[PDB]
Amino acid sequence: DWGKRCVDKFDIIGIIGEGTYGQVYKAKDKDTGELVALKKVRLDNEKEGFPITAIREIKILRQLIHRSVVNMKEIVTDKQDALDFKKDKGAFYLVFEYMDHDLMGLLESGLVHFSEDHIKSFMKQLMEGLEYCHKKNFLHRDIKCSNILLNNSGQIKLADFGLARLYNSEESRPYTNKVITLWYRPPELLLGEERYTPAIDVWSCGCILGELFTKKPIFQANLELAQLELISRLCGSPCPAVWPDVIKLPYFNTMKPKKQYRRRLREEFSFIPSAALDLLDHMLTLDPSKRCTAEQTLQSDFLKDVELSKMAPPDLPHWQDCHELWSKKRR
Amino acid sequence: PCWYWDKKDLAHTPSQLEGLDPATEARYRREGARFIFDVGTRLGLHYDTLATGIIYFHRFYMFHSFKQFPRYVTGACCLFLAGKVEETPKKCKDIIKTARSLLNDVQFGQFGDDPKEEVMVLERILLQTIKFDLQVEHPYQFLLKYAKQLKGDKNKIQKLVQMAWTFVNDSLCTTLSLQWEPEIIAVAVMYLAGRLCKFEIQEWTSKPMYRRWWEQFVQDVPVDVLEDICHQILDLYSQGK
């Protein structure tokens, strides 16, 4: 019975930013004391009202309770016009777990350099959350560095499920296609694929895996065509040899790179650890069918034995568990 | 949260307890439900989008009276949310264009001065009323998944689910969505479509001698309960198709 509780339950600390729907605030709860993120859903009438972005998020997060995902704790509302109603204008507040930093903010400093053991730890967590989403048939469709949050305890959580939609393999209907930020957008979406696979998120995580080593985004264009060449300049050009079913893609024969590049990936990322390069090579395959799945990423030599298990030292107290919610997720 | 009542408890809605003729609630419900079904298909919306809006509607009036909330405006609001939920959203402008259009001019009077506001502002309490439980499943999904696991002649199946499907469309005007899980309703319409067509359904399953074929999809569901769902639907053809 969400939306009944009061915001007076929460002591607001500060404004984190303007979000995809209204604004995002940091706040603590006067009852427990644990800190919380609040997404303000200001309801605008004479427009379209309750945003789908807030709806996609709610619908999915109430089915996703996992360690590597910022979980939605509850929903709370403003005041209570016990008279009239119809006067409205009150907002709804989405209550999430709180993370201090995002990977984009940290990497922007040029101060933080993650050791291989950390990247091994970060990816293992990330690919475990995405594997969970895909196991429950949800596409994130908006995976970027600014959407990958990180607290001081080392814990990674995937955020912003405002573009996330349910997926079935029976190819039910065309999707939006113009999804994901241009820099983290896979080749098939650039060529105009409408009915896409979960392997689009795996591409984005791969582009982030390369960014953790190079300390800079590996694909950085401004227009869609120029982005394809940058990919071709590294992963090789999309063509029937490397990729059987590109011919069935709409903008292929029209949107071509300058030459038929030979794949130069292992050459430009040669400084990267061997097993890490093996994973990056796989996560950044042109043909989505030959691309790596999230389930498979955790079976790579680079992630397979990365022990995130909380029995080995050290004991981190500030780690946000989810077995409270998951247990409570019986009701 | 739970969204399923037993038959003994549905005679205790806030509407009726406030002194309402049960026969008129069924009217208001069958009317309101059918209203959504028509407004949706005219806007050209998916069938699951139609059903979620209807199930929202049925659920809403289990916590509110038809007196305090005009039957026809709520249904419009339910469809508005449902469009956004099932990722087939229409602007509220386009639905109000259907609100005046397919409807009695005094039935349109329910929306008051500004249908937009009356629909848009209502959304706030609708979301709160359904306890922010936005994902809803339907007998449609299970009907197909069960018929795909049936091993016999296709053109018998093709006609089997052809009439079982329509039955789900029929049932939406009633509180079956408020009575049984969508899987069990899906089993029931397979049971019914199999009887009136004289198709014996077991003979297409792994065990052709267990008469109660359905337990291969569900668990321990009695033939009694299944016949209850069937009867409630038979009354629909008896009066309003």
Residue numbers in the entry:
A (entry chain C): 718 to 1048
B (entry chain D): 22 to 262
Q: What do the study authors state?
A:
Human CDK12 (CrkRS) and its close homologue CDK13 (CDC2L5) are unusually large CDK family members (1,490 and 1,512 amino acids, respectively) containing a central kinase domain with flanking arginine-serine-rich (RS) domains. Recent work indicates that these CDKs regulate transcription via assembly with the 65 kDa cyclin K1 subunit (herein CycK). Ser2 phosphorylation is required for transcriptional elongation and is performed by both CDK12/CycK and CDK9/CycT (P-TEFb; the positive transcription elongation factor b), which are identified as orthologues of S. cerevisiae Ctk1/Ctk2 and Bur1/Bur2, respectively. Here, we report further structures of CDK12/CycK complexes solved in the presence of AMP-PNP and containing variable truncations of the C-terminal kinase extension.
